[PDB]
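README: folding subset

This subset contains proteins for which both the sequence and a predicted structure token string are available. Records are stored as plain text. Below is the entry for ATPase family AAA domain-containing protein 2 (130 residues), shown exactly as it appears on disk.
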Amino acid sequence: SMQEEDTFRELRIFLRNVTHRLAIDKRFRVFTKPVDPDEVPDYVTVIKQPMDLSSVISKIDLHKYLTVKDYLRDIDLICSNALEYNPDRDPGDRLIRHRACALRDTAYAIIKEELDEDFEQLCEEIQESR
Ligand SMILES: CC(=O)N[C@@H](CC(N)=O)C(=O)NCC#CBr
Ligand SMILES: [Cl-]
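--- output ---
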């Protein structure tokens, strides 16, 4: 229905705003664009589902997220990809892990404070009805 389409549009506006707030944070610059294959030729071979915030915006606009849970799965990938690709004890890898964990924690904290649970439940029930 049109009411359902209005629900999903509101979801996309909410998700674009959360993603923009993460993307303008200087800590998260490395996560704003795909990894450049030049600098990192082994990336695309180790990490089977690369994800970054530009890809998340593209997904929102392609109507790929019908619930906040689906969006958080991709935020979780940005975090877990960095834990997997940069697991060493040296400071460069520790800094990327701490930034990727902080992204994830920040997205979850904004959603805890600003997503109404009944709005998410509605999205879940429309998605399940399709
Ligand atoms: C290269 C690397 O090992 N670290 C990555 C972090 C990552 N897990 O995507 C990085 O900082 N951005 C890509 C580049 C380059 Br230069
Ligand atoms: Cl830096």
